[PDB]
Amino acid sequence: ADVQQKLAELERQSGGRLGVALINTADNSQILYRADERFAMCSTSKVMAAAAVLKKSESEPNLLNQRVEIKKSDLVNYNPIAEKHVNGTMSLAELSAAALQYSDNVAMNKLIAHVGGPASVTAFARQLGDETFRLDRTEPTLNTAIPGDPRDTTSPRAMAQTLRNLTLGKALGDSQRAQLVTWMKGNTTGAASIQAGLPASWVVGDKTGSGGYGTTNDIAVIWPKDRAPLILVTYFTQPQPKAESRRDVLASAAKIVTD
Ligand SMILES: [Cl-]
Ligand code: NA
């Protein structure tokens, strides 16, 4: 299914292509919709870059304190935090927080560069058992979201399983996992997406993204009141190049699968 019918109907009414994967850790059950199709990740890929840096810090414990210069030449399209620090430095911890909580694209590019480029973030994903994730490009071009283009894509199923490993599992050490969850709970950009379809009392850590072709994404770890955590991935994309974002579709999908 009944939830599948409602998602198919939401998709048809929306005019786009919807991918959903819910993991309920209470009973290890899943709700899946187009969950093995590829979708452009857009800014949701920032979680994997931050996670790769945190993994690196398990071996180099002072890594997150290392400072990185911010130059005018680093600025790209959307840099709400980095633009305030031009000609100074930011620590890798501050860049990680900026990437996750404000979606700062300079922060993302500095994280990518630190771990060795997009192929190195992809190799980290493979290390975790994720053979679907691929990060191909840097900011800002990784957000083009051209239909049929596999670059910078993953599937709802793979991202949900990887997010479970990163936030609820043991992919990262205890301190690092706690830090990632803390940053995601502090996201400033997610109130209109998955969170908008959930009860007010539930706690959410999420990362949003949007891009070309009206691509509107959110990936979330959810702590419902008095229940075990959920993982929810909602990806959406549209047929027209200049389509407007549809965060309401993500909220509605969240409401349907958690009822
Ligand atoms: Cl258009
Ligand atoms: Na993935």
33 strand-pairing partners: 20
Q: Quick one: which ligand is closest to 156's CA?
A: 2
Cis peptide before 224 (omega within 30 of 0): no
β partners of residue 218: 208, 234
Rounded-to-integer distance, Cα 53 and Cα 176, Å:
10
Domain containing residue 215: CATH number: 3.40.710.10
CA of 71 to the centre of ligand 2 (A): 31
The count of domains in the chain is: 1
* Calpha distance 154→101 (Å, rounded): 21
Cα-to-centroid distance, 238 and ligand 1 (Å): 10
Ligand 1: centre distance to CA 40 (Å): 18
Question: Which two three-digit tokens encode residue 3?
Answer: 């939830």
* Closest ligand relative to 45 C-alpha: 2
Rounded Cα distance, 21 and 33, in Å: 6
- Cα(44) to centroid of ligand 2, in Å? 10
Counting ligands in written order, which one lies closest to the CA of residue 243? 1
User: Obtained via which technique?
Assistant: X-ray
- What angle in degrees, to the nearest 10, is found between the helix axes of 92-102 and 105-115? 130
249 with 181: CB under 8 angstroms? no
Closest ligand by atom to 235 CA = 2
The catalytic site residues sit at 43
Ligand 1 mean position, distance from CA 42 (Å) = 19
Give 131 Cα–ligand 2 centroid separation in angstroms: 8
| Amino acid, single-letter form, for residue 2 | D
Task: Decide: 122 and 115 in contact? Cβ < 8 Å.
Answer: no
Q: Is the dihedral of CA 125, 210, 221, 249 positive or negative?
A: negative
Domain limits for position 172: 2-258
CB neighbours of 212 closer than 8 A, spacing ≥ 6? 40, 143, 144, 145, 146, 241
